């Protein structure tokens, strides 16, 4: 069907070639052994071939290859003569290829500039399907539209600076120096809960479903219910400030300025493990339910087994503070003040790549994002760079602040498959604080 329907309407007759003569099915079995790059060339051979190469099911399986899961059903209208039944899975595959190509060597379209948080800093950034939330030490948060540019709402309520944030379609959560957390309604921008319990600055927080865990400078963590607004548990055991936290709904993992990483079972407010090894403050964490990954001011990154508390790998090589890390499928990427970024396999402990070279960052890496093709890094050098994850090679500078060398800095970045959001500013007055939104979507 569909391919049959095409043969009997276009009528491509008399072909003196191998595949045009083979029973439809066997031609398809054959074409399946080709890679997309080939199917696309083969499709330009002749009308008969083109029709075959468009077999919807040949691509549905080629999309599972690149992990698409969703075919796109495109643009209607007044047909060009001899019709053609396009394959949704094929166009879906091509869309992604063009998007990847747009990021890689596209052509930077000037980004939407979103001015806000004047003469202040952006401490946290959140990006969730069309909505952007910026957090600042000016005591506010602003919900933006990644689509238009406009500020939709400004969450005023905190009496201290905002330093932590989390979000899940319409539910925003903030953590302030005013010692409280606040649950907001992104659409109406109204505060719906104010959580008291912490006595010192609310430094970090991780949200999982209907619960959120916060880490504070009071050396404790609190687990709250985003709906009721109640505090469910209090994790006490840390001696110094809790800088980072991860929560998967089963265990709470935390890193504090006491060089310790603690694994908790919230329900019973009990510390199951205290992970010892780092010789200085632990700033960053990542947790996949099996491995806890910690980054310290001590230069190392440790990989631990959550179940035994046993250290599995001590990843060495960085030279300064590992500020940010991202874990995914046992692949870890770390951003470091030594201006380097590293890609590791936390199963073997191998350091797959170090992102440096002639176009490496000039100062500390402030943030990073990554997927199966690229690594995106931001820095105080005023640039956001795009790197090839597989080769570890530099690709290009997505952003290059003119004031980069004199104050301009990119504090944070959030990337979707189709766009990049950057938090920009400066301590002196060379760069007005704002968000930059780059669009890498394709016309289809």
């Amino acid at each position: 069907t569909q391919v049959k329907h095409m043969m009997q309407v276009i009528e491509p007759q008399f072909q003196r070639d191998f595949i045009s003569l083979l029973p439809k099915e066997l031609a398809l079995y054959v074409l399946s052994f080709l890679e997309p790059k080939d199917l696309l060339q083969a499709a330009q051979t002749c009308r008969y071939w083109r029709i075959l190469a468009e077999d919807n099911l040949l691509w549905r399986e080629k999309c599972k290859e690149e992990g698409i899961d969703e075919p796109l059903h495109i643009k209607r209208r007044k047909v060009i003569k001899p019709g053609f039944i396009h394959s949704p899975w094929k166009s879906a595959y091509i869309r992604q290829h063009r998007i990847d190509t747009n990021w890689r060597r596209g052509e930077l379209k000037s980004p939407k500039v979103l001015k806000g948080h004047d003469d202040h800093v952006i401490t946290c950034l959140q990006f969730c399907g069309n909505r952007i939330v910026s957090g600042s030490d000016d005591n506010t948060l602003k919900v933006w539209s990644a689509v238009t540019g406009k500020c939709l709402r400004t969450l005023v309520g905190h009496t201290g600076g905002v330093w932590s944030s989390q979000m899940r379609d319409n539910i925003i959560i903030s953590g302030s120096t005013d010692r409280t957390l606040k649950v907001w309604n992104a659409e109406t921008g109204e505060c719906i809960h104010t959580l008291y319990g912490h006595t010192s600055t609310v430094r970090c927080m991780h949200l999982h479903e209907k619960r959120v865990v916060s880490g504070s400078r009071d050396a404790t963590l609190r687990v709250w219910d985003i709906e009721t607004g109640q505090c469910l548990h209090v994790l006490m055991g840390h001696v110094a400030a809790v800088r980072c936290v991860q929560y998967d709904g089963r265990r709470v993992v935390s890193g504090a300025y006491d060089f310790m990483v603690k694994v908790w079972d919230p329900e019973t407010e009990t510390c199951l493990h205290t992970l010892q090894g780092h010789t200085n403050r632990v700033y960053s964490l990542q947790f996949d339910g099996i491995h806890v990954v910690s980054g310290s001011l001590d230069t190392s990154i440790r990989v631990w087994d959550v179940e035994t508390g046993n250290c599995i790998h001590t990843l060495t090589g960085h030279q300064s503070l590992t500020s940010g890390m991202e874990l995914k499928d046992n692949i870890l990427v770390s951003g470091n003040a030594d201006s380097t970024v590293k890609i590791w396999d936390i199963k073997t402990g191998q350091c797959l790549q170090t992102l440096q070279g002639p176009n490496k960052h000039q100062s500390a890496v402030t943030c990073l994002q990554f997927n199966k093709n690229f690594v995106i890094t931001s820095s105080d050098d005023g640039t956001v760079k795009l790197w090839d994850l597989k080769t570890g090679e530099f690709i290009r500078n997505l952003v290059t602040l003119e004031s980069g060398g004199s104050g301009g800095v990119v504090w944070r970045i959030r990337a979707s498959n189709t766009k990049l959001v950057c938090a920009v500013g400066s301590r002196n007055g060379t760069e007005e604080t704002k968000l930059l939104v780059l669009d890498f979507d394709v016309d289809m």
């Binding site: 401490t123 201290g160 120096t177 430094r203 400078r217 503070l321 003040a337 402030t366 105080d380 800095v409």
Partner: peptide, 12 residues
């Protein structure tokens, strides 16, 4: 602290 990184000012 490396330039480009932040923390709230000390409270007490």
């Amino acid at each position: 602290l490396p330039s480009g990184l932040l923390t709230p000012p000390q409270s007490g």
